[PDB]
Structure 1
């Protein structure tokens, strides 16, 4: 809508207070005009009809419990935009400042979030397995990163290319969490998963096997569930990313860590320059090795750690 840019305040899902960019025109709307062609957050109103209604508020304060998921979807979309802009010089997911749109209160008791080809969508969870999913910065950045992937490499959501697609979303979700310094870790979804139970998460990058995901290629899932294991086999790549950044010894192979910034630059380059829609794990290794060579030279430590890390997870 057309109006005056202003700043509202509200409380997110975890009860923290934050300022959000709004637009005023009779009502205050969750429309942030400060970022690209805008960030827009919608109320799906417990239905499945998308996007629903652009979020309107009478007084520019967002402290109702019903408001909380909209506050975080709006705020964390902004943070994720800032990460791609400031760190990788990328303007929104398409590179040309496309409007970022999210809907919250999707369906009833819905324990997931997704990118639907055009926008992000967040369920409220059922209160036991999940609380509203936009509460996790790593979840929000995970979903938006699918948009970045679709516009760059175009990784198919199937089999190994699909597991690469998922891993890229976990990797950048985690790097965004670190960038925002929101109690960061190498776990996925810990902030919104099983509110009754502390210390768990949906997936682990530092140790995938903790929740039964493979941490080595010899352990890959080869069946048909989960589109050929796109959320399961991503563990193999997630462990590799973790090793490249943090270092460690895994199945007897030692890896010297090169840090998160370099992990990010290497994988952003592989994604936007060398990956293709049908890329498999072996090609991801080649892409990532070629990216580190481009950036740091063929005899650098950075190329060596990338090779070490893929060796460690059995990807040749």
Structure 2
């Protein structure tokens, strides 16, 4: 739409009030955010299995209805993700060229999913038991949007070690996005949307992958063919290494000095963008992470040493 930049208000999935960037055109306001380097659009599929649906239009610039909630969050959190990338690394959208961010909410009926489809963000509303509206969790959004960035860089193949690395990368960043918005931060993934009645859980944990049965050491990796070679479980190995590099700890007899989330982020960003390839394995991830740290802090630096220490802890050389 073409119009005038407005600022509205609405309530998200968890019931919190949020500030919205919309556009006034004719008699209505549209969930269209013209404020950033990339345009952000939010759509309504009206509980159908169609894409992208209808661009979202409101009569008064107030998004306080129960039906509004998923759209308010989808809208807000994508602008927050753009922000994280723009401020931290000077990245202009998913492709470094201002590609627009599109999201469809109310997709299907009681659909327990949300993913980047290679072109836009897709959100279902959940069954209200296993999940709630999928747009209410910032780390899951940051995770999927980061998949858009890998595709525009390393392009890690979704199978075996390189696929797990892909998954790991996306968790690291979604976590980073959550800390970014001071969105009650932690190292678990999906706790704001998962099993709305049970407090305590998440889909997986970076601090202790074994809580959910994921491996936390190379010697314990899944070796078969299921899940494109165990893509979603083996990522726990890289997740654990990332956690120890940011916060420190003792793991399998190896003591790691943490360097903080900001350097963890710069090291992985640099690694994924200049060093990783489509088929980077965990051993090459170590070497590339090591080179990134050397470039960033110096070859004989304490950072580089932490990098080495962190992989050692998880059995990767």
TM norm structure 2: 0.98
2:135 equivalent in structure 1: 134
Instruction: State the alpha-carbon separation in 1 of the partners of residues 87 and 241 from structure 2.
Output: 25
2:240 equivalent in structure 1: 239
Deviations 1:74-113 (A, max 9, x none): 1000111000000111011100111011111111121121
Matches within 5 A, 1:1-316: 1-25=1-25, 26-316=27-317
- Give the C-alpha shift of residue 37 in structure 1: 3.1
- Give the C-alpha shift of residue 136 in structure 1: 0.6
Deviates more, 1:226-235 or 1:148-157: 226-235
Instruction: State the alpha-carbon separation in 2 of the partners of residues 160 and 124 from structure 1.
Output: 32
SS of alignment partner, residue 277 of structure 2: coil
Deviations 1:124-166 (A, max 9, x none): 1111110011101101111110001100110111111111111
SS of alignment partner, residue 184 of structure 2: coil
Instruction: State the alpha-carbon separation in 1 of the partners of residues 123 and 246 from structure 2.
Output: 30
Instruction: State the alpha-carbon separation in 2 of the partners of residues 216 and 119 from structure 1.
Output: 34
SS of alignment partner, residue 230 of structure 1: helix
- Give the C-alpha shift of residue 224 in structure 1: 2.4
How many residue pairs were aligned?
Answer: 316
Deviations 1:199-244 (A, max 9, x none): 1100100000000000011111122222221111110000000000
Deviations 1:12-35 (A, max 9, x none): 000000111001112211100001
Deviates more, 1:24-33 or 1:169-178: 24-33
Q: Which sections of structure 2, spanning at least 5 residues, go unmatched?
A: none
Instruction: State the alpha-carbon separation in 1 of the partners of residues 4 and 281 from structure 2.
Output: 48
Q: Which sections of structure 1, spanning at least 5 residues, go unmatched?
A: none
- Give the C-alpha shift of residue 48 in structure 1: 2.2
SS of alignment partner, residue 46 of structure 1: strand
SS of alignment partner, residue 45 of structure 1: strand
Instruction: State the alpha-carbon separation in 2 of the partners of residues 255 and 206 from structure 1.
Output: 14
TM norm structure 1: 0.98
Instruction: State the alpha-carbon separation in 1 of the partners of residues 227 and 179 from structure 2.
Output: 28
